[PDB]
Design a protein around this ligand. Structure first.
Ligand SMILES: O=C(N[C@@H]1CCCNC1)c1ccccc1
Length: 182
C-alpha cells in the first residue's frame, strides 16, 4: 500500500523460502549465498524441507550472546543449488528501536501476509516459553501461531525475525550485521 510494504514485498519475493521441520512450517529468511535464518525452536536437524524439497543441512548454529544467553536465532547453511540475493547491507549494525515496521509471513497457512505492526521497542530481556532470551524487539500486535520466522522490516532495513507473542504483543529476535560476517 506504501513504501514500507514495498520494501517488505521485495524481501519476501526474493529472500524467503518455506522451511518445514518436525516442529512445523516456518517463514525462513535467506541472507546471502546458501545461508538463512529460522527461530531456534524450529529444532533444525540434518535434513529440512525447503519449498517441499528434501534438503541436507550443511551446517547450523543456535546463536547465544556472550552472557551464554539464548538469542532464538539459528543460522542454517542449506545444500541448495541456488544462492540468495545478498541482503547483508540491509541489516542493522547495532541494537535499536524503530518506527513503522512491517511483519511479513509466507507459509501454506498464511501466504503473502503483511502486517503493519507500528512502533518497535528494543525490549531486551524476555522469558520466551520459559527460556531467558536477549535482544528481543516488541510490537503491539496480537500475533498468532504460524507467524514465527516472519520477517520484520522498516524501509531499507531487515531488523528481526518473529519468535513469539503473549496474545497482545509480538516479539522478534534482532538480526545484526555481525551475525553474518564470513
Ligand atoms: O558458524 C557456523 N557453524 C559453526 C560450525 C559448527 C556449527 N556451529 C558453529 C555457521 C555459519 C554459517 C552458516 C551455518 C553455520
Amino acid at each position: 500500500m506504501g513504501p514500507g510494504f514495498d520494501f517488505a514485498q521485495a524481501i519476501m519475493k526474493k529472500n524467503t523460502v518455506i522451511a518445514r521441520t518436525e516442529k512445523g512450517e516456518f517463514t525462513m529468511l535467506g541472507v546471502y549465498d546458501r545461508v538463512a535464518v529460522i527461530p531456534t525452536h524450529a529444532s533444525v536437524g540434518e535434513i529440512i524441507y525447503i519449498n517441499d524439497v528434501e534438503t541436507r543441512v550443511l551446517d547450523a548454529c543456535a546463536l547465544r550472546d556472550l552472557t551464554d544467553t539464548n538469542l532464538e536465532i539459528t543460522i542454517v547453511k542449506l545444500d541448495r543449488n541456488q544462492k540468495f540475493r545478498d541482503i547483508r547491507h540491509f541489516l542493522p549494525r547495532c541494537e535499536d528501536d524503530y518506527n513503522d515496521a512491517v511483519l511479513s509471513v509466507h507459509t501454506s497457512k498464511f501466504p503473502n501476509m503483511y502486517i503493519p505492526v507500528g512502533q518497535v521497542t528494543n525490549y531486551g530481556f524476555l522469558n520466551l516459553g520459559g527460556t531467558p532470551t536477549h535482544r528481543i524487539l516488541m510490537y503491539n500486535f496480537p500475533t498468532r501461531a504460524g507467524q514465527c520466522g516472519g520477517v520484520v522490516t522498516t524501509t531499507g532495513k531487515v531488523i528481526g525475525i518473529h519468535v513469539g507473542g503473549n496474545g497482545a504483543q509480538g516479539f522478534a529476535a534482532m538480526l545484526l550485521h555481525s551475525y553474518f560476517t564470513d
